[PDB]
Each structure stands twice: as structure tokens, then as C-alpha cells.
Amino acid sequence: PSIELWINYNNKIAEAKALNGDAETVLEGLELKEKTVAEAVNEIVQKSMELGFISREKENIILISTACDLKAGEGSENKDVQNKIGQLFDDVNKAVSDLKNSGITTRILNLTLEERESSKEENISMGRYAVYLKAKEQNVNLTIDEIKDADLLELIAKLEHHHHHH
């Protein structure tokens, strides 16, 4: 499942858009618009669990990548939106603790909108693209070809093991 949850200025989901056909079958039947990120993560992971797109008994990996462009402020100061973004990431990390608790690895990556745009033209989701980000940070040569064809299990494993083995 590959999904992009648009979050609007009310700290609610504007629209949910799947990038993978299996994720379409996850989104169907779920109200996600007046939910927060943690809510969406929980809805998506739990439906993927039922449907067999993620295993509860088997070891998996979930990547929550959030990309945020703050080009607005409103009120009298941009800290109004920054408090919303604080609550946003507050909510994101709580989902991680909730969904990973079953013995599944869940991780958080942060991206900018410019990174989101790069993943859109390659029609890939931001989670797998965020492992590509870590490849660039650790100076490992992973290509966009690698990222789009590979499994997220392989992607997170190779990057986090790179930072473990010398």
C-alpha cells in the first residue's frame, strides 16, 4: 500500500490518494478526511492487515514520511501554523508507537515539498522516496530505479543496517 494523505490547515486530511492499486482497496470504505495522521495510519495499517497487505504475525516495516511546506502563517504570525505542525508530528509519532507495538517496525522520515514533487513525477510514494533520502545522507548510491522496484522491507533494512555495520 502506497498512499498520500493531504493535510489541510484545519489539521485534517484534505484528500487521500492512493498510488498503488492495493491501497485503493484499503481506502475504500474509510472516512479519513476529518481524521488526523495517526488516525489515517491506524485505519490504513489495520485494513491492510485484514486484507493481507501487511502481516501481523510476520515481521514488517511501515514508513511514515511527512513532507511539509510552510508557506503560510495567518492570524498575526506563522507560529500559528507551526503549533499545528507540532500537533501534527505529535500525532504522527503516537501512531508509530501504536502500530509498531504488534512487533512491526514503524519509522518516521521527514521530507520537504520539493522531495514530494520528485516522488510524484516518478509516481512513487514518499515513504519509499524517504529511504532514498537516507541513502543521500549516508552517501550510499541508490538510484530511483532501485527505490521504485524494491520492497520497503529491503529499503529500510539496507539503510539502517548500513548505519549499523562498519
Binding site: 489541510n8 489515517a40 497487505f53 511501515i62 511527512t66 511546506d69 501554523v81 504522527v92
Partner: peptide
Amino acid sequence: MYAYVGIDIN
């Protein structure tokens, strides 16, 4: 405009 959350599973 605000945030975009990418959820990748598998």
C-alpha cells in the same frame, strides 16, 4: 500547502 503524508507499507 501544509503537509503531505506518505504511507508506505510493503
